[PDB]
Amino acid sequence: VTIVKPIVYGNVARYFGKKREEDGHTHQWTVYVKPYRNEDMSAYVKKIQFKLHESYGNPLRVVTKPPYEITETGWGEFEIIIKIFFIDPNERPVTLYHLLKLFQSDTNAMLGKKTVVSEFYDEMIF
Numbered sequence: 001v002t003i004v005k006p007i008v009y010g011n012v013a014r015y016f017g018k019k020r021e022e023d024g025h026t027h028q029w030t031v032y033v034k035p036y037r038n039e040d041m042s043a044y045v046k047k048i049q050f051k052l053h054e055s056y057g058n059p060l061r062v063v064t065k066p067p068y069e070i071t072e073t074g075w076g077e078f079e080i081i082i083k084i085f086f087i088d089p090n091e092r093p094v095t096l097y098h099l100l101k102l103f104q105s106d107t108n109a110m111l112g113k114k115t116v117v118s119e120f121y122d123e124m125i126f
């Protein structure tokens with residue numbers, strides 16, 4: 001009948017420990033789309049587009065083969081528009097919106113967590 005493919009999307013980020021003098025960048029981050037289970041999304045995903053902030057060169061980043069990740073460095077938080085394109089042209093692209101998290105919440109800072117993780121769950125239906 002119907003096919004449901006769970007996914008996780010979001011980002012991870014880590015503070016440099018000091019501001020980089022060359023560009024004022026403070027964090028390294030990775031935005032991603034991953035299958036929840038250990039499997040090959042390229043079977044049904046054509047490409048995943050990650051629209052970054054205007055301060056980034058070539059802000060419309062396209063990933064055609066797994067892993068569907070973009071690693072960059074920066075200093076501020078912004079919204080990333082993630083658009084998932086399917087192999088089947090009859091399947092409308094999936095649009096996700098994700099706020100890039102760089103700064104650790106006081107709760108997680110107190111829990112001694114080193115890296116920021118902002119991950120969300122979704123299910124793609126076919």
Ligand SMILES: CCNC(=O)c1ccc2c(c1)nc(C)n2[C@H]1CCN(CC2(O)CCCCC2)C[C@@H]1C
Pocket residue numbers: 053055056073074075076077078079099
């Ligand atoms: C090449 C490296 N540049 C960057 O890393 C970068 C990141 C963010 C930037 C930026 C450059 N230049 C501006 C104006 N911003 C802003 C983008 C909107 N956000 C606002 C926000 O997205 C925050 C989280 C809560 C919701 C609103 C506030 C930000 C200072």
